[PDB]
Design a binder for this molecule. Structure first.
Ligand SMILES: O=P(O)(O)O[C@H]1[C@@H](OP(=O)(O)O)[C@H](OP(=O)(O)O)[C@@H](OP(=O)(O)OP(=O)(O)O)[C@H](OP(=O)(O)O)[C@H]1OP(=O)(O)O
Ligand SMILES: Nc1ncnc2c1ncn2[C@@H]1O[C@H](COP(=O)(O)OP(=O)(O)NP(=O)(O)O)[C@@H](O)[C@H]1O
Ligand SMILES: [Mg+2]
Ligand SMILES: [Mg+2]
Ligand SMILES: [Mg+2]
Ligand SMILES: [Mg+2]
Ligand SMILES: [Mg+2]
Length: 325
Protein backbone atom coordinates (compact mmCIF):
# COMPACT_ATOMS: atom_id res chain seq x y z
CA UNK A 1 0.00 0.00 0.00
CA UNK A 2 0.86 3.71 -0.33
CA UNK A 3 2.59 5.58 2.49
CA UNK A 4 0.10 8.20 3.68
CA UNK A 5 1.34 11.65 4.70
CA UNK A 6 -1.32 13.47 6.73
CA UNK A 7 -1.38 17.27 6.87
CA UNK A 8 -3.04 18.63 10.00
CA UNK A 9 -3.41 22.40 10.47
CA UNK A 10 -5.83 25.30 10.16
CA UNK A 11 -7.29 25.82 6.68
CA UNK A 12 -5.56 29.25 6.42
CA UNK A 13 -2.28 27.30 6.43
CA UNK A 14 -3.28 24.02 4.70
CA UNK A 15 -4.82 25.94 1.76
CA UNK A 16 -2.06 28.58 1.51
CA UNK A 17 -0.22 28.95 -1.81
CA UNK A 18 3.13 27.62 -0.48
CA UNK A 19 1.46 24.61 1.13
CA UNK A 20 -0.43 23.76 -2.07
CA UNK A 21 2.74 24.06 -4.17
CA UNK A 22 4.72 21.81 -1.82
CA UNK A 23 1.96 19.18 -1.46
CA UNK A 24 1.53 18.79 -5.25
CA UNK A 25 5.29 18.11 -5.42
CA UNK A 26 5.31 15.62 -2.53
CA UNK A 27 2.43 13.85 -4.32
CA UNK A 28 4.85 13.23 -7.23
CA UNK A 29 6.58 10.60 -5.07
CA UNK A 30 5.43 7.26 -6.49
CA UNK A 31 4.71 5.64 -3.11
CA UNK A 32 3.38 8.67 -1.22
CA UNK A 33 -0.25 9.78 -0.97
CA UNK A 34 -1.07 13.09 0.72
CA UNK A 35 -4.22 13.50 2.82
CA UNK A 36 -5.09 17.01 4.04
CA UNK A 37 -7.29 16.94 7.18
CA UNK A 38 -10.36 19.18 6.79
CA UNK A 39 -10.54 22.07 9.29
CA UNK A 40 -14.14 21.14 10.25
CA UNK A 41 -12.91 17.62 11.16
CA UNK A 42 -9.95 18.97 13.15
CA UNK A 43 -12.13 21.35 15.16
CA UNK A 44 -15.37 19.33 15.44
CA UNK A 45 -14.63 15.57 15.18
CA UNK A 46 -13.06 13.44 17.92
CA UNK A 47 -9.51 12.29 17.08
CA UNK A 48 -10.73 8.67 16.75
CA UNK A 49 -12.56 9.79 13.56
CA UNK A 50 -9.62 11.66 11.99
CA UNK A 51 -8.05 10.09 8.86
CA UNK A 52 -5.21 7.61 9.30
CA UNK A 53 -1.67 8.46 8.25
CA UNK A 54 1.79 6.91 8.53
CA UNK A 55 3.58 10.25 8.68
CA UNK A 56 2.04 13.35 10.26
CA UNK A 57 2.85 16.97 9.43
CA UNK A 58 0.96 19.01 11.98
CA UNK A 59 1.53 22.46 13.41
CA UNK A 60 -0.08 25.06 15.63
CA UNK A 61 -1.30 28.44 14.51
CA UNK A 62 -3.99 30.78 15.87
CA UNK A 63 -7.12 28.74 16.68
CA UNK A 64 -5.54 25.27 16.31
CA UNK A 65 -6.42 22.60 18.92
CA UNK A 66 -2.90 21.37 19.75
CA UNK A 67 -4.37 19.19 22.55
CA UNK A 68 -6.25 17.16 19.91
CA UNK A 69 -3.23 16.84 17.59
CA UNK A 70 -1.17 15.48 20.50
CA UNK A 71 -3.97 13.00 21.38
CA UNK A 72 -4.24 11.89 17.74
CA UNK A 73 -0.47 11.26 17.57
CA UNK A 74 -0.59 9.31 20.86
CA UNK A 75 -3.51 7.25 19.49
CA UNK A 76 -2.10 6.44 16.03
CA UNK A 77 1.68 6.71 16.65
CA UNK A 78 2.60 8.14 13.22
CA UNK A 79 6.09 9.29 12.29
CA UNK A 80 5.98 12.97 13.34
CA UNK A 81 7.87 15.57 11.21
CA UNK A 82 7.42 18.51 13.61
CA UNK A 83 7.19 17.44 17.27
CA UNK A 84 3.82 18.45 18.70
CA UNK A 85 4.65 18.87 22.40
CA UNK A 86 7.51 21.27 21.56
CA UNK A 87 4.84 23.46 19.92
CA UNK A 88 3.53 24.37 23.39
CA UNK A 89 6.98 25.73 24.28
CA UNK A 90 7.35 27.63 20.99
CA UNK A 91 4.29 29.70 22.08
CA UNK A 92 6.25 31.06 25.08
CA UNK A 93 9.19 33.37 24.37
CA UNK A 94 10.67 32.54 27.79
CA UNK A 95 10.83 28.85 26.89
CA UNK A 96 12.33 29.63 23.47
CA UNK A 97 15.21 31.70 24.88
CA UNK A 98 15.76 29.04 27.58
CA UNK A 99 16.28 26.32 24.92
CA UNK A 100 18.56 28.56 22.82
CA UNK A 101 20.81 29.24 25.83
CA UNK A 102 21.03 25.51 26.63
CA UNK A 103 22.27 24.96 23.04
CA UNK A 104 25.07 27.55 23.26
CA UNK A 105 23.30 29.74 20.67
CA UNK A 106 24.14 33.46 20.75
CA UNK A 107 21.12 35.59 21.64
CA UNK A 108 20.61 39.15 22.88
CA UNK A 109 21.26 39.74 26.59
CA UNK A 110 17.81 39.57 28.18
CA UNK A 111 15.77 39.52 31.39
CA UNK A 112 12.25 38.32 32.13
CA UNK A 113 9.74 40.48 33.99
CA UNK A 114 6.95 38.24 35.26
CA UNK A 115 3.92 40.16 36.57
CA UNK A 116 1.14 38.94 38.83
CA UNK A 117 -2.00 40.53 37.28
CA UNK A 118 -3.37 41.14 40.82
CA UNK A 119 -0.18 42.73 42.20
CA UNK A 120 1.07 44.65 39.11
CA UNK A 121 3.46 47.06 40.90
CA UNK A 122 5.09 44.47 43.21
CA UNK A 123 7.26 43.27 40.30
CA UNK A 124 11.01 43.68 39.89
CA UNK A 125 11.09 46.71 37.59
CA UNK A 126 12.74 50.10 38.12
CA UNK A 127 12.45 52.69 35.38
CA UNK A 128 14.64 55.70 34.60
CA UNK A 129 14.31 57.98 31.56
CA UNK A 130 17.20 56.28 29.69
CA UNK A 131 17.16 52.78 31.17
CA UNK A 132 15.23 50.05 32.93
CA UNK A 133 16.37 47.68 35.68
CA UNK A 134 14.73 44.26 35.50
CA UNK A 135 15.51 41.88 38.40
CA UNK A 136 18.49 44.20 39.08
CA UNK A 137 19.83 43.91 35.53
CA UNK A 138 20.32 47.23 33.70
CA UNK A 139 19.23 47.80 30.09
CA UNK A 140 20.25 51.15 28.67
CA UNK A 141 18.13 52.51 25.81
CA UNK A 142 17.78 51.40 23.08
CA UNK A 143 16.18 48.19 24.39
CA UNK A 144 13.41 45.86 23.19
CA UNK A 145 10.25 44.85 25.08
CA UNK A 146 8.50 41.64 23.99
CA UNK A 147 5.24 40.12 25.30
CA UNK A 148 6.01 36.73 26.88
CA UNK A 149 3.47 35.19 24.49
CA UNK A 150 5.20 34.49 21.14
CA UNK A 151 1.80 34.88 19.45
CA UNK A 152 1.52 38.51 20.62
CA UNK A 153 3.41 40.57 18.01
CA UNK A 154 3.22 43.90 19.87
CA UNK A 155 6.98 44.30 20.30
CA UNK A 156 8.17 47.77 21.39
CA UNK A 157 11.57 49.41 21.02
CA UNK A 158 12.50 52.30 23.32
CA UNK A 159 14.79 55.08 22.07
CA UNK A 160 17.39 56.93 24.15
CA UNK A 161 17.01 60.66 24.90
CA UNK A 162 20.06 61.27 22.66
CA UNK A 163 17.92 60.04 19.74
CA UNK A 164 14.72 61.95 20.60
CA UNK A 165 13.19 59.41 23.00
CA UNK A 166 9.79 57.83 22.47
CA UNK A 167 9.28 54.31 21.18
CA UNK A 168 8.62 52.24 18.07
CA UNK A 169 5.54 50.02 18.30
CA UNK A 170 5.68 46.91 16.07
CA UNK A 171 2.69 44.80 15.01
CA UNK A 172 1.48 42.18 12.49
CA UNK A 173 1.53 43.99 9.13
CA UNK A 174 -1.58 46.00 8.32
CA UNK A 175 -1.32 46.83 4.61
CA UNK A 176 1.64 49.16 4.11
CA UNK A 177 2.85 49.41 7.74
CA UNK A 178 4.67 47.13 10.19
CA UNK A 179 5.33 49.68 12.97
CA UNK A 180 4.63 53.21 14.16
CA UNK A 181 6.45 55.80 16.29
CA UNK A 182 4.96 56.77 19.65
CA UNK A 183 6.08 59.75 21.79
CA UNK A 184 5.59 57.45 24.83
CA UNK A 185 8.94 56.92 26.57
CA UNK A 186 7.76 54.83 29.53
CA UNK A 187 7.45 51.01 29.37
CA UNK A 188 4.15 49.13 29.47
CA UNK A 189 2.76 48.85 33.00
CA UNK A 190 0.59 45.74 32.71
CA UNK A 191 1.53 42.29 31.38
CA UNK A 192 4.71 40.18 31.45
CA UNK A 193 7.63 40.96 29.12
CA UNK A 194 11.11 40.01 28.08
CA UNK A 195 13.48 42.99 28.01
CA UNK A 196 16.51 42.64 25.78
CA UNK A 197 19.48 44.58 24.40
CA UNK A 198 18.91 46.18 21.00
CA UNK A 199 21.31 44.66 18.46
CA UNK A 200 22.54 47.14 15.83
CA UNK A 201 22.16 45.66 12.31
CA UNK A 202 22.43 47.26 8.83
CA UNK A 203 18.64 47.75 9.06
CA UNK A 204 17.61 44.29 7.86
CA UNK A 205 16.51 41.05 9.58
CA UNK A 206 17.55 37.66 8.22
CA UNK A 207 14.73 35.09 8.07
CA UNK A 208 15.89 31.48 7.99
CA UNK A 209 13.74 28.53 6.87
CA UNK A 210 14.97 25.00 7.60
CA UNK A 211 13.90 21.72 6.01
CA UNK A 212 15.66 19.26 8.28
CA UNK A 213 18.98 20.12 9.92
CA UNK A 214 21.10 20.18 6.74
CA UNK A 215 19.06 22.55 4.56
CA UNK A 216 18.31 26.20 5.24
CA UNK A 217 17.09 28.95 2.94
CA UNK A 218 17.68 32.49 4.14
CA UNK A 219 16.49 35.89 2.96
CA UNK A 220 16.58 39.41 4.36
CA UNK A 221 13.89 42.02 4.82
CA UNK A 222 13.88 45.63 5.99
CA UNK A 223 13.55 45.68 9.79
CA UNK A 224 10.05 46.79 10.96
CA UNK A 225 11.89 48.75 13.66
CA UNK A 226 13.36 51.16 11.04
CA UNK A 227 10.37 53.39 10.16
CA UNK A 228 7.57 50.87 9.70
CA UNK A 229 6.82 51.44 6.00
CA UNK A 230 6.65 48.06 4.20
CA UNK A 231 8.63 47.88 0.92
CA UNK A 232 6.42 46.17 -1.63
CA UNK A 233 7.19 45.13 -5.19
CA UNK A 234 5.28 46.15 -8.24
CA UNK A 235 3.56 42.84 -7.71
CA UNK A 236 2.48 43.53 -4.09
CA UNK A 237 4.83 41.13 -2.26
CA UNK A 238 7.21 42.36 0.46
CA UNK A 239 10.69 43.04 -0.96
CA UNK A 240 13.19 40.36 0.08
CA UNK A 241 17.00 40.55 -0.22
CA UNK A 242 19.39 37.68 -1.05
CA UNK A 243 21.29 36.00 1.78
CA UNK A 244 23.81 33.17 1.90
CA UNK A 245 24.42 31.80 5.39
CA UNK A 246 28.03 31.53 6.59
CA UNK A 247 29.40 28.44 8.36
CA UNK A 248 28.44 29.71 11.84
CA UNK A 249 24.88 30.41 10.67
CA UNK A 250 24.48 27.04 8.98
CA UNK A 251 25.40 25.51 12.36
CA UNK A 252 22.82 27.71 14.10
CA UNK A 253 20.14 26.36 11.73
CA UNK A 254 21.23 22.75 12.43
CA UNK A 255 21.02 23.39 16.20
CA UNK A 256 17.63 25.15 16.07
CA UNK A 257 16.02 22.47 13.92
CA UNK A 258 17.24 19.70 16.25
CA UNK A 259 16.74 21.45 19.60
CA UNK A 260 13.10 22.32 18.89
CA UNK A 261 12.51 19.04 17.00
CA UNK A 262 10.87 20.99 14.15
CA UNK A 263 11.96 19.60 10.77
CA UNK A 264 10.33 22.60 9.04
CA UNK A 265 11.33 25.62 11.18
CA UNK A 266 11.50 29.36 10.69
CA UNK A 267 13.73 31.57 12.83
CA UNK A 268 15.16 35.12 12.69
CA UNK A 269 18.82 36.23 12.85
CA UNK A 270 20.28 39.63 13.67
CA UNK A 271 23.64 40.21 12.00
CA UNK A 272 25.34 42.52 14.49
CA UNK A 273 28.87 43.23 15.77
CA UNK A 274 30.42 40.57 13.48
CA UNK A 275 28.19 37.76 14.83
CA UNK A 276 24.66 36.43 14.28
CA UNK A 277 22.08 36.44 17.09
CA UNK A 278 18.81 34.49 17.13
CA UNK A 279 15.93 36.73 18.22
CA UNK A 280 12.84 34.62 17.41
CA UNK A 281 12.01 30.96 16.67
CA UNK A 282 8.62 30.47 14.96
CA UNK A 283 8.45 26.76 14.13
CA UNK A 284 6.61 25.62 11.01
CA UNK A 285 7.02 28.13 8.22
CA UNK A 286 7.43 27.90 4.42
CA UNK A 287 9.29 30.31 2.13
CA UNK A 288 6.85 32.28 -0.04
CA UNK A 289 7.36 32.92 -3.80
CA UNK A 290 10.46 30.82 -4.41
CA UNK A 291 9.89 28.00 -6.91
CA UNK A 292 13.31 26.49 -6.09
CA UNK A 293 12.36 26.27 -2.41
CA UNK A 294 9.08 24.52 -3.33
CA UNK A 295 11.10 21.92 -5.28
CA UNK A 296 13.78 21.44 -2.63
CA UNK A 297 11.38 21.38 0.33
CA UNK A 298 9.13 18.79 -1.31
CA UNK A 299 12.13 16.59 -2.30
CA UNK A 300 13.68 16.73 1.16
CA UNK A 301 10.41 15.97 2.97
CA UNK A 302 9.56 13.14 0.56
CA UNK A 303 13.06 11.72 1.08
CA UNK A 304 12.72 11.89 4.90
CA UNK A 305 9.41 9.99 4.68
CA UNK A 306 10.91 7.35 2.36
CA UNK A 307 14.08 7.00 4.50
CA UNK A 308 12.01 6.41 7.64
CA UNK A 309 9.16 4.26 6.32
CA UNK A 310 10.22 2.48 3.10
CA UNK A 311 11.72 -0.54 4.96
CA UNK A 312 8.42 -1.06 6.86
CA UNK A 313 6.49 -1.03 3.60
CA UNK A 314 9.04 -3.25 1.80
CA UNK A 315 9.77 -0.46 -0.69
CA UNK A 316 13.31 -0.26 -2.09
CA UNK A 317 15.00 3.04 -1.26
CA UNK A 318 18.56 4.30 -1.76
CA UNK A 319 19.24 7.56 0.09
CA UNK A 320 19.87 10.45 -2.37
CA UNK A 321 22.08 13.55 -2.21
CA UNK A 322 20.49 16.86 -1.19
CA UNK A 323 21.40 20.55 -1.34
CA UNK A 324 22.17 22.52 1.83
CA UNK A 325 20.74 25.65 0.19
O1 LIG B 1 5.04 31.64 9.27
P1 LIG B 1 3.60 31.74 8.53
O2 LIG B 1 3.64 31.13 7.20
O3 LIG B 1 2.56 31.06 9.55
O4 LIG B 1 3.16 33.32 8.43
C1 LIG B 1 3.32 34.25 9.49
C2 LIG B 1 4.39 35.29 9.12
O5 LIG B 1 5.65 34.64 8.91
P2 LIG B 1 6.78 34.67 10.07
O6 LIG B 1 6.16 33.79 11.28
O7 LIG B 1 8.10 34.17 9.58
O8 LIG B 1 6.88 36.20 10.64
C3 LIG B 1 3.98 36.03 7.84
O9 LIG B 1 4.93 37.07 7.59
P3 LIG B 1 5.74 37.09 6.21
O10 LIG B 1 6.95 36.24 6.26
O11 LIG B 1 4.75 36.62 5.00
O12 LIG B 1 6.08 38.63 5.93
C4 LIG B 1 2.61 36.71 8.00
O13 LIG B 1 2.21 37.25 6.73
P4 LIG B 1 1.62 38.77 6.63
O14 LIG B 1 1.83 39.52 7.89
O15 LIG B 1 0.26 38.66 6.05
O16 LIG B 1 2.64 39.37 5.53
P5 LIG B 1 2.12 39.95 4.11
O17 LIG B 1 1.52 38.88 3.26
O18 LIG B 1 1.10 41.16 4.46
O19 LIG B 1 3.42 40.67 3.45
C5 LIG B 1 1.52 35.76 8.51
O20 LIG B 1 0.44 36.58 8.93
P6 LIG B 1 -1.10 36.32 8.45
O21 LIG B 1 -1.04 35.43 7.09
O22 LIG B 1 -1.82 37.61 8.30
O23 LIG B 1 -1.74 35.36 9.59
C6 LIG B 1 1.99 35.00 9.75
O24 LIG B 1 0.96 34.09 10.16
P7 LIG B 1 0.44 34.14 11.69
O25 LIG B 1 1.78 34.06 12.61
O26 LIG B 1 -0.52 33.02 11.97
O27 LIG B 1 -0.16 35.64 11.87
N1 LIG C 1 17.05 42.39 20.28
C1 LIG C 1 16.76 43.02 19.13
N2 LIG C 1 17.62 43.89 18.59
C2 LIG C 1 17.32 44.51 17.39
N3 LIG C 1 16.09 44.22 16.79
C3 LIG C 1 15.25 43.35 17.38
C4 LIG C 1 15.59 42.74 18.54
N4 LIG C 1 14.61 41.92 18.92
C5 LIG C 1 13.54 41.97 17.94
N5 LIG C 1 14.05 42.94 16.98
C6 LIG C 1 13.35 43.43 15.76
O1 LIG C 1 11.92 43.38 15.99
C7 LIG C 1 11.35 42.50 15.01
C8 LIG C 1 10.23 41.70 15.68
O2 LIG C 1 10.71 40.95 16.81
P1 LIG C 1 10.45 39.40 16.87
O3 LIG C 1 11.12 38.87 18.09
O4 LIG C 1 10.80 38.80 15.58
O5 LIG C 1 8.86 39.45 17.08
P2 LIG C 1 7.68 38.48 16.51
O6 LIG C 1 6.51 39.19 17.04
O7 LIG C 1 7.90 37.09 17.00
N6 LIG C 1 7.72 38.59 14.90
P3 LIG C 1 7.47 37.26 13.84
O8 LIG C 1 8.87 36.98 13.16
O9 LIG C 1 6.37 37.59 12.95
O10 LIG C 1 7.12 35.92 14.76
C9 LIG C 1 12.48 41.61 14.55
O11 LIG C 1 12.21 41.16 13.24
C10 LIG C 1 13.65 42.57 14.55
O12 LIG C 1 13.62 43.43 13.38
MG1 LIG D 1 2.25 9.97 -5.01
MG1 LIG E 1 3.48 30.38 13.52
MG1 LIG F 1 -1.46 39.31 7.13
MG1 LIG G 1 10.38 37.46 14.22
MG1 LIG H 1 7.85 35.15 16.19
Amino acid sequence: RQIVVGICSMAKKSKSKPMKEILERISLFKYITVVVFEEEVILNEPVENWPLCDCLISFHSKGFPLDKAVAYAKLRNPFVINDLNMQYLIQDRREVYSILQAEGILLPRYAILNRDPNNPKECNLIEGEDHVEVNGEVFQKPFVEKPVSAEDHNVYIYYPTSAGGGSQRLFRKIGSRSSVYSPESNVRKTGSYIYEEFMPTDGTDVKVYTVGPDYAHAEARKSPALDGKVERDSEGKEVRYPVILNAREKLIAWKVCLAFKQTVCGFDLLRANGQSYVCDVNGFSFVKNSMKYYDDCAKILGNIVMRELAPQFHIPWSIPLEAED
